[PDB]
């Protein structure tokens, strides 16, 4: 089996209001993201014949 990493989607920042200028909200919100994996595999194909 082979495993491959998949990068996640995009986030988005925030428009901070003027009222919260001096507070901690001026930093905006937090953007998170978790990686993902995909797997590959195979199958066996066989045939036989006699003489």
């Amino acid at each position: 089996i082979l495993t491959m990493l998949v990068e996640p989607d995009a986030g988005r920042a925030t428009w901070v209001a003027a009222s919260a200028y001096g507070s901690d909200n001026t930093t905006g919100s937090e953007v998170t993201g978790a990686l993902t994996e995909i797997h590959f595999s195979t199958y066996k194909l066989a045939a036989k014949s006699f003489i």
Binding site: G22, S23, D24, T27
Partner: protein, 49 residues
């Protein structure tokens, strides 16, 4: 002469960077007091009741 001014530290400033708010706090502190040797040496006049 009966009064003194005990003092530990002078007027000192301190600046701090608060990235969580992008505000730059400023702090000024000092430690002082007003004390007398004995329990006398002051008189106050006051208005009538």
């Amino acid at each position: 002469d009966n009064f003194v001014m005990p003092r530990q530290r002078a007027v000192t400033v301190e600046r701090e960077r608060q990235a969580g708010k992008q505000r730059d706090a400023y702090y000024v502190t000092q430690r002082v007091n007003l004390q007398r040797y004995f329990e006398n040496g002051v008189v106050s006049g006051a208005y009538a009741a």
